[PDB]
Every structure is written in structure tokens, then in C-alpha cells.
Amino acid sequence: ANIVGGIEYSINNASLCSVGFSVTRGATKGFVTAGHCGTVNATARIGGAVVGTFAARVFPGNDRAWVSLTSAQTLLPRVANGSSFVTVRGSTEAAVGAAVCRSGRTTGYQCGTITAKNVTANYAEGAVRGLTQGNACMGRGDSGGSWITSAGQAQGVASGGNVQSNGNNCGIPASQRSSLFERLQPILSQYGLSLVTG
């Protein structure tokens, strides 16, 4: 499979999540995603084909993971935007007020601005701390997907938000949305990963 930020993958033939960013760990290829998407050793599939397994994750507390893929997968420095792509150029962290977009299998590519950092989400499983909040909308299934600036600076992976009854927060005004992501920086250093860039 071609690994691109935003695409769907399934976990143990049950749940769906979105790919965050292609990365490497020495000769190992992988992608970063949300920790709540799978447990260590869960099987990830893309288009019905096994692509790898969860190598590590932290959730709750934090919300991160990386899936180590088979050597047959093709890592790409790109994030899906409809039928087009955003090139990943690095991971400079944007400040409050910067514009940012996110990509995932449920709502596609949505943009907004970062509104707050170091937010705590109180999920049924336990608190997740240190999240960054944006007002781009998101839906069930977008978790793990890419958050990136139009300039290509990868910001983190989707964790959660104030989902409404229709499964997203897209039918409420930007001012009322809370869409949270896990910062990418700490995930790269925690697992010794390098981002694939182009």
C-alpha cells in the first residue's frame, strides 16, 4: 500500500482509524497514529491487506502510537487533501492562532486555527493531557489522522473532540468546536522516529 497521511486503516478487522505520518525507525518503516486506535501487536490493514502491527502506544494519559510496517509498504511524505496532496516538510510546531488543517477518512481535509495548547480531555478511559485544540471539524474515524499546516509542518495526530449526535462537530460553529490532537514532537523523540519529508 502507499502510506499517505489521512487514509483509512482498520485494526484487527474491527475499528477504523486514519494514518498520521509516514516515519522510519532505522531501517524500519512505520506510521504514527492515535494510541486509542489499537493495542500493541494489533493488526493494521489497508484495503483489506495486512500492512503491519502496533509496535507501541500510550493511552490514556497521552494518546500516541506507531505501527511498524512490512518492508513491502511505500512510505510517502504526503497528506491526502481530496485527490491532491500536501507535502510534509518538517515538524515546526505552530503557535496559538496559526491556521492548520487535518485529514482523515471520515470528514476529509478540514482547516481552522489552533485555539489552545495543553488541554486535558476527560475520556471515559481516563484523562489525556497536553493536547492542542483547533477548531477544524472532525468526525468518528478521523482519529490518528494528520494535523498539518498548508506549509507542510506536521503538528500532530487527531485524538478526539466534542462529537455531536451525527458523529462529527462539523454541523456546529467553529467557535464551539473542540478538536484535539496529540503533538507530534514528543511522539518522535519518545520512539526515536524520523519523519519522511519531501
Partner: peptide, 4 residues
């Protein structure tokens, strides 16, 4: 808030 809920995960996703």
C-alpha cells in the same frame, strides 16, 4: 469529549 470523546476519542474519534
Amino acid at each position: 469529549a470523546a476519542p474519534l
